Every structure is written in C-alpha cells, then in structure tokens.
Amino acid sequence: ANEGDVYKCELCGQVVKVLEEGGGTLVCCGEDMVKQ
Amino acid sequence: ANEGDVYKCELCGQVVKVLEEGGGTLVCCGEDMVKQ
Numbered sequence: 860a861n862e863g864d865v866y867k868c869e870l871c872g873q874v875v876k877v878l879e880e881g882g883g884t885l886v887c888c889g890e891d892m893v894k895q
Numbered sequence: 896a897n898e899g900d901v902y903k904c905e906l907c908g909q910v911v912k913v914l915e916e917g918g919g920t921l922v923c924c925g926e927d928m929v930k931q
C-alpha cells in the first residue's frame with residue numbers, strides 16, 4: 860500500500876496509516892484490510 | 896495493537912501507524928508485523 864493511505868479492519872475496527880510503502884497486502888483478523 | 900504504536904513488515908519494508916486500536920494481529924507478506 861501507499862504512503863498516507865488509511866486502512867481499516869472491518870472485523871475488529873483496527874485502523875492503520877501507511878508511513879512507508881511496501882508491496883505486501885495488509886491483513887487483520889485473517890482478512891485483507893479495507894482502504895478508506 | 897495500541898494506538899500510536901508503529902508496526903513493520905520485515906520482509907517488504909512496509910511501515911504503518913495504528914490510529915485506532917483493535918485486537919487483531921497485523922499481517923503483511925504472510926507474516927506477523929513487528930512492533931517498533
């Protein structure tokens with residue numbers, strides 16, 4: 860994901876912001892996090 | 896994870912900051928991210 864992007868786990872409500880991009884897919888509670 | 900915490904993927908270099916705590920485990924590149 861890209862710098863500045865915001866991602867949410869719809870299952871546990873966790874929310875993260877990307878500070879440094881990397882090519883992996885962010886996952887939480889076993890599912891792909893959802894970009895906001 | 897705790898709000899304000901920073902997590903890193905050791906394999907792809909992606910870095911995220913937690914804006915809202917949830918108890919799920921952050922995963923990237925199929926591996927648990929590491930709290931910085």
Ligand SMILES: [Ga+3]
Binds near residue numbers: 881882904906908924
């Ligand atoms: Ga990674």
Ligand SMILES: [Ga+3]
Binds near residue numbers: 870873917919
């Ligand atoms: Ga979760």
